[PDB]
Amino acid sequence: IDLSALRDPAGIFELVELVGNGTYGQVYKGRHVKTGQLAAIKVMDVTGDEEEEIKQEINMLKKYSHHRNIATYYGAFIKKNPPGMDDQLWLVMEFCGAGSVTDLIKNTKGNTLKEEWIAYICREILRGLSHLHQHKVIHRDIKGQNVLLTENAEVKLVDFGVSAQLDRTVGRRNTFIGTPYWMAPEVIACDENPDATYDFKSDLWSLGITAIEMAEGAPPLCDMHPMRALFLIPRNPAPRLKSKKWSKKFQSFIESCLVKNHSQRPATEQLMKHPFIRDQPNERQVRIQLKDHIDRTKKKRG
């Protein structure tokens, strides 16, 4: 890509406010100057050292974010600064006004979501992942914070900042990256074993952890230092839901994502056939319930 070809955003997009109290770093609520359309705008310095990472992120946004379960890319802008000073890059995308899944859990009594909500959100994440995996992309940072909701309760993935683009379906990677509590054992192995590798199945493990996060309010081992969780994830039994209150169908779905040996872990197509994902006869009411929660939360703040 050509960063020099990018337009200055003045008169096109404007920054309104930093989002989520800094939880996502330099991500802003923005607005189109002419139409008033909202957007999320990620702001970064263009240093010569992060060129490959910036290119990977723009390429993912440009090529794959049109899918209904990914927050859509609107374009990129550059604020040029004088010689010796770093230019700033803006990546502009769809604004998911209802916030994250982590926020949904925080704003729900008992910090636990109903199974029917978890089935709906997991299916939408799996559809977004299936689209990415079909295009040889590994997201590598699936977690509740990167799963957002629109005001209409549509589910959208964000943040391609640590993603990978493979050359073949069976392609492998070895970068130790991601968020510890959600990381698959085979990704964790790359920190201390230089010969260890992984593949796209790592995203399905992260999805299973995200489902536990929605059910129990936090991923397993959340109450421990991340270095201790990294030590335990490869050696502990695969996580399961603690309570037997959950349906056997949901318990079975978690048992399916959370296979430690990734060679034996299912891909998205096999997981989307699971009865927990496949059978959703109340999805219309789930979306009404989610929209009612969204509307109430918006009113409660002021």
Ligand X SMILES: CC(C)(O)c1cnc(N)c2nc(-c3ccnc(F)c3)ccc12
Write out the residues near ligand X by the rule CB under 6 A.
Answer: 19-20, 24, 27, 40, 42, 71, 93-96, 99-100, 148, 158-159, 161
Q: Is 26 in the site for Mg ion (CB under 5 A)?
A: no
Q: Which of 44, 58, 70, 138 binds Mg ion (CB under 5 A)?
A: 70
Closest CB to Mg ion among residues 71, 277: 71
Q: Pick what 70 binds: ligand X, Mg ion, none; C-beta below 5 to 8 Å, kind-dependent.
A: Mg ion
Closest CB to ligand X among residues 29, 114: 29
Q: Pick what 96 binds: Mg ion, ligand X, none; C-beta below 5 to 8 Å, kind-dependent.
A: ligand X
Q: Nearest approach, Cβ of 154 to Mg ion (angstroms)?
A: 9
User: For 101-104, which contacts have Cβ atoms below 8 Å and span 24 or more sequence positions?
Assistant: 101/144, 101/145, 101/147, 101/148, 101/149, 101/210, 101/213, 101/214, 102/143, 102/144, 102/145, 102/213, 104/149, 104/290, 104/293
Q: Is 72 in the site for Mg ion (CB under 5 A)?
A: yes
Closest CB to Mg ion among residues 61, 183: 61
Is 141 designated active site? Answer: yes
Q: Nearest approach, Cβ of 68 to Mg ion (angstroms)?
A: 6
List the beta bridge partners of residue 139: none
Q: Nearest approach, Cβ of 199 to Mg ion (angstroms)?
A: 25
Which of 49, 86, 87, 141 is the catalytic position?
141
Size of the site for Mg ion (CB under 5 A): 2
Residue whose C-beta lies closest to Mg ion = 72
Q: Nearest approach, Cβ of 33 to ligand X (angstroms)?
A: 19
Buried b (16+ CB within 10 A) or exposed e, 39-69: bbbbbbebeeeeeeebebbbebbeebbebeb
Chain breaks in the chain (C to N over 2.5 A) after: none
Q: At what angle do helices 283-301 and 115-134 cross, to 10 degrees?
A: 100
Closest CB to ligand X among residues 24, 176: 24
Q: Is 150 in the site for Mg ion (CB under 5 A)?
A: no
Most distant pair of Cα atoms in the chain: their distance? 63
Q: Pick what 100 binds: ligand X, Mg ion, none; C-beta below 5 to 8 Å, kind-dependent.
A: ligand X
Q: Nearest approach, Cβ of 236 to ligand X (angstroms)?
A: 30
Map tokens 């169908």 to a residue.
249
Residues that bind Mg ion (CB under 5 A): 70, 72
Q: Enumerate the active-site residues.
A: 141
